[PDB]
Design a protein around this nucleic acid. Structure first.
Ligand SMILES: Nc1nc2c(ncn2[C@H]2C[C@H](O)[C@@H](COP(=O)(O)OP(=O)(O)OP(=O)(O)O)O2)c(=O)[nH]1
Ligand SMILES: [Mg+2]
Ligand SMILES: [Mg+2]
Ligand SMILES: [Mg+2]
Ligand SMILES: [Zn+2]
Length: 994
DNA sequence: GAGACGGGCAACC
DNA sequence: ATAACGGTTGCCCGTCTC
């Protein structure tokens, strides 16, 4: 039985063992099945191939899964397609993982009091969930979590404590400075837990130096509910009398091996230092505990950490020397390590005292169960009058029954579950943005709420389709279900006052937002312009008070691309030539480790005034930047999703684009029609653009249109040809999410199994259909919510579906969908698409200026200026690279597509112009666009803005004058000069005056 | 060596 | 061409310049 590190060349025959971390099965022309696995015994890894000789072995092959251990016998061959040695297996047997066993007797087990998770930035490697499982299996009565300076593993630890029935001790390894050394904090109770949250907050904010730290006095202030430990070799006492020590409730000592970095003479000195501490805890009646300082599960997991640390260069200084063995140690093996102090002391400090400390810890719940909802005087009642007054002024007094009932039902739910405040705050945020000159785009599931329509938090009106007279208030509603959206109606006059009817209503059920029980916590989503987002953000400090809102924080972890990067460099720097399969496994062992912190892209977390942020999470600065305008949550929004309401104040280009489209045409985009035949025609043809498909390398007219302009969506449009608002809404829905169209709805339509309109194209339809079919609404809602998060179906859901005659293809279709819009989102985004489309057709140059000004960031200006044929040449170059195209080539391709179409429509791009070019805005001149300075590679907004500033306060008098005052590098100056831009100026002036 | 700038990446809606 | 979810903010780090 050969270890995988010993497999180095072709070889007739070997037997080998290992963990299967990947397995795929495929079918050969011959009939035969091939099994392709990767295995690692943790000394190395290898790719294994097996070719079935019969259908029995073929199906067994299908049963080999990740997580299995396997003994394989076979030959070692160079495989030239994989460019690596590989095992061709004749024989395969599943085996036991037979991992480290804990042999002490039940009741007499160890507790680990000092342990690091992947949240110990770039320092630890095994998820807290796996450590917690291991402790449970080894029968440890508890296990502690004590990451460095942070408590970010708490939420996962909790979950795993619950799933596994393990008692977790919530802690912190902290940096204490005297008023810089490590201590261990263990929370005994909720007072202790809250003090932990305060300590991490203070250490990250008031007391952050170059690293989070806690003055000893501030620790004492916040010591209640915490047992304090001395600990490490970076401990206070280990680095040396009794005074220091009497400060601690427990005294830490690590296995002798752990201190092997040696500051010391030999192993006999360390053994004795440990023995001083043993004398010293006994003399002072302080429990001495054998803790492990865990940084990974098993001895061999060491390698992953070694790789992470190595990625930090001489900036780390732990690369100065070999890393200590700090794996999770069994209780019997912890005794072995401490055998020298004899059988009684071994046993005392490894199990009795370790166990005793655990007994001093209660049952702490680090994350709460319920939602805490804000109160602001007048809010419930103001939302009521706002919505009734506004509905009356549109639908009349008294209200039609339909409207009356939607209001009464909606308002008692919003109010009762405590959402009236955020509706109102959302109203003021939108109103201020408008007053400040920035329109706001609608988003997400609040469009499902007519009260939200009435409070001007969404432009989506969810009532059934209908006409309403803007003058006399008369209405007609259609509940036939025959009409998809009011926007689909034919123009019609009020048969009472004569006037032109308004059309509206997308038939969206309120429950998509709050559900039936009101036991779901949605947010409110708003698309503000990216320019304005920060100001919307700051307005929430004014509304709620500076200390009752916090920007949601994020944790930056190592994902695949970074892991593979780290592993290769480590391989390279060490002159290792590794097999693909071994690079993969080292890669996989690095993922999940925290590397940074950051900012949610827009969520503001609201704290009720009768609670405090520390009831929920610590706070800090994103990336630890002490000049940040905003503090962040220490936990990410996902951990506290159900505890506090969130305002998703997002940034987006759509609102900015149509704002500039309006500031340029004078056209009020609210007046744009949603059934203009030429505008709607671009969703299925190039006709309305006045160019050929061959001219613009595209069969539909949606180039540049948000969402619909993509290569995938264009193709869907080619084959679905929508003409109607609700048809566009249907395809918005099926174009967003994996396994929604491809392999699913597409096959269903091409099969004849259902029609385009019957395919599942928003989450709402699932619910609405299941109710129709006879399921209990709240269950239909549950099922909708499960599938739109790509969680598929439970046996109970399927059985409820079947028993009400839901067909097998619909159920199977639910199981595919990985993600899915709510209708109100699709309708919001489509409405914006159509507004912009209107300009694409009727005011083309305005459309292009706004496109290149607001959205584009990657240009080939020389190509663009030469024009049509040159642009096409570049696009073909990028097309040729296929999916081997870099993210950046794709961004360029996207913009060149719209430039080529611009050119074919008869327009063009002029060179940079010293006196007519602007800073960041593409400006209109006749039938052209004069590109702005920031379009130049290397020339950013700043220089762009300076160049414009300087010329406004005095023309340029030489190329030198332009360089000095325009703040231009030599390279940028050459860029202009070589394209003829500076030809009218002398190189320098022979005169200068003040 | 301080600081724009852009690429590459991760988190999130 | 293939297959294909689209679009946004934010953080780190190597490069190029002065
Ligand atoms: N294309 C795409 N859009 C998304 C995705 N996730 C969210 N969005 C868009 C569509 C959603 O309606 C909105 C997401 O906002 P939320 O995360 O607040 O969810 P939503 O409002 O749909 O449900 P909620 O009631 O808030 O739980 O933004 C996604 O994975 N892909
Ligand atoms: Mg330490
Ligand atoms: Mg430690
Ligand atoms: Mg939402
Ligand atoms: Zn009328």
């Amino acid at each position: 039985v050969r270890r995988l590190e010993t497999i180095v060349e072709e070889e007739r025959r070997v037997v080998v063992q290992g963990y299967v971390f990947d397995a795929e099965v495929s079918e050969l022309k011959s009939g035969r099945t091939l099994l392709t696995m990767k295995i690692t015994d943790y000394t190395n890894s290898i790719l294994v191939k097996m070719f079935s000789r019969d259908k029995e072995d073929a199906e067994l092959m299908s049963g080999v899964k990740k997580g299995m251990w396997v003994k394989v016998r076979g030959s070692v061959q160079n495989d030239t397609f994989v460019r690596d040695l590989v095992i061709i297996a004749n024989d395969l047997n599943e085996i036991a993982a037979n991992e480290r066993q804990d042999t002490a007797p039940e009741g007499e087990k160890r507790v680990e009091l000092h342990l690091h998770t992947p949240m110990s930035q770039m320092d630890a490697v095994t998820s807290v969930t796996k450590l917690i499982e291991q402790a449970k299996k080894w029968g440890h009565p508890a296990i502690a979590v004590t990451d460095h300076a942070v408590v970010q593993s708490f939420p996962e630890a909790y979950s795993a404590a619950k799933k596994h029935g393990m008692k977790v001790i919530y802690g912190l390894e902290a940096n204490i400075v005297d008023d810089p050394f490590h201590v261990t904090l263990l929370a005994q109770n909720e007072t202790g837990l809250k003090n932990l949250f305060k300590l991490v907050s203070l250490s990250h904010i008031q007391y952050f130096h170059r690293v989070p730290r806690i003055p000893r006095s501030v620790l004492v202030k916040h010591r209640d509910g915490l047992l304090v430990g001395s600990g490490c070799d970076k401990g206070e006492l280990f680095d040396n009398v009794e005074d220091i020590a009497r400060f601690y409730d427990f005294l830490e000592v690590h296995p002798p091996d752990v201190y092997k970095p040696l500051y010391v003479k030999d192993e006999e000195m360390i053994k004795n230092i440990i023995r001083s501490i043993v004398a010293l805890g006994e003399k002072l009646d302080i429990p001495v505990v054998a803790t492990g300082n865990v940084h990974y599960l098993n001895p061999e997991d060491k390698i992953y950490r070694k790789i992470l640390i190595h990625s930090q260069g001489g900036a780390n200084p732990l690369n100065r020397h070999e890393l200590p063995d700090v794996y999770f140690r069994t209780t019997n093996e912890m005794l072995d390590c401490f055998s020298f102090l004899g059988p009684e002391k071994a046993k005392e400090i490894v199990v009795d005292n370790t166990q005793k400390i655990a007994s001093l810890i209660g049952d702490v719940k680090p994350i709460k169960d319920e939602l805490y909802t804000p109160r602001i005087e007048g809010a419930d009642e103001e939302i009521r009058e706002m919505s009734y007054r506004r509905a009356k002024e549109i639908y009349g007094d008294p209200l039609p029954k339909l409207v009356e009932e939607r209001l009464e039902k909606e308002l008692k739910s919003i109010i009762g579950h405590g959402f009236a405040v955020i509706y109102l705050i959302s109203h003021k945020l939108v109103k201020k943005s408008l007053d400040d000159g920035y329109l706001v785009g609608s988003r997400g599931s609040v469009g499902s709420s007519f009260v939200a329509t009435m409070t001007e938090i969404t432009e989506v009106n969810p009532l059934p389709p209908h006409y309403v007279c803007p003058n006399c208030k008369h209405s007609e509603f259609f509940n036939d279900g025959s009409v998809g959206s009011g926007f689909d109606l034919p123009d019609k006059n009020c048969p009472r006052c004569g006037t032109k009817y308004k059309k509206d209503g997308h038939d969206i059920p309120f429950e998509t937002f709050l559900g039936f029980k009101g036991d779901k916590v949605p947010d409110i989503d708003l698309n503000f312009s990216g320019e304005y987002q920060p100001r919307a953000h700051n307005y929430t400090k004014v509304l709620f008070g500076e200390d009752n809102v916090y920007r949601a924080g994020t944790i930056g972890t190592v994902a695949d691309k970074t892991a593979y990067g780290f592993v290769k460099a480590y391989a390279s720097d060490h002159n290792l030539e590794l097999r693909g399969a071994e690079i993969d496994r080292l890669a996989a062992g690095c993922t999940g480790v925290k590397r940074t912190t950051g900012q949610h892209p827009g969520g503001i977390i609201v704290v009720p005034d009768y609670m405090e942020i520390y009831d929920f999470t610590p706070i800090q600065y994103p990336a630890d930047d002490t000049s940040s305008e905003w503090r962040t949550t220490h936990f990410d929004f996902h951990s506290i999703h159900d505890n506090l309401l969130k305002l998703d104040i997002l940034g987006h280009d759509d609102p900015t684009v149509i704002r500039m489209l309006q500031d340029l045409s004078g056209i009020d985009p609210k007046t744009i029609p949603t059934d203009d035949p030429d505008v709607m025609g671009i969703f299925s043809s190039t006709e309305p653009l006045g160019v050929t498909p061959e001219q613009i390398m595209c069969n539909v007219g949606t180039i540049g249109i948000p969402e619909f302009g993509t290569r995938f969506v264009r193709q869907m449009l080619e084959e679905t040809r929508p003409k109607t608002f609700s048809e566009l809404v249907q395809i918005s829905g099926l174009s967003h999410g994996t396994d929604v169209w491809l392999g699913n709805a597409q096959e269903l339509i091409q099969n004849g199994t259902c029609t385009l309109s019957e395919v599942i194209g928003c989450r709402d339809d699932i619910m609405v259909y299941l109710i129709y079919r006879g399921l209990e609404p709240s269950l239909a809602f549950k099922i909708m919510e499960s599938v739109r998060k790509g969680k598929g179906l439970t046996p109970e859901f399927e059985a409820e579906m079947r028993k009400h005659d839901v067909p097998e293809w619909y159920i199977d279709s639910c199981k595919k969908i990985k993600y899915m819009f709510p209708k109100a989102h699709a309708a919001a985004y489509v409405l914006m698409a159509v507004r912009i489309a209107y300009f694409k057709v009727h005011h083309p140059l305005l459309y292009y200026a706004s496109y290149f000004t607001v959205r584009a960031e990657d240009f080939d200006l020389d190509a663009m200026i030469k024009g049509s044929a040159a642009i096409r040449k570049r696009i073909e170059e990028i097309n040729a690279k296929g999916i081997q195209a870099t993210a950046k080539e794709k961004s360029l391709l996207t913009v060149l597509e719209v430039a080529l179409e611009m050119c074919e429509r008869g327009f063009s791009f002029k060179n940079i112009d010293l006196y007519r070019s602007q800073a960041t805005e593409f400006v209109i001149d006749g039938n052209s666009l004069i590109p702005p300075f920031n379009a130049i590679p290397g020339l950013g907004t700043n220089v762009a803005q300076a160049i414009v500033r300087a010329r406004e306060e005095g023309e340029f008098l030489s190329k030198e004058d332009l360089q000095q005052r325009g703040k231009l590098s030599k390279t940028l100056l050459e860029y202009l000069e070589s394209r003829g831009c500076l030809d009218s100026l002398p190189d320098h002036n022979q005169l200068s005056l003040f």
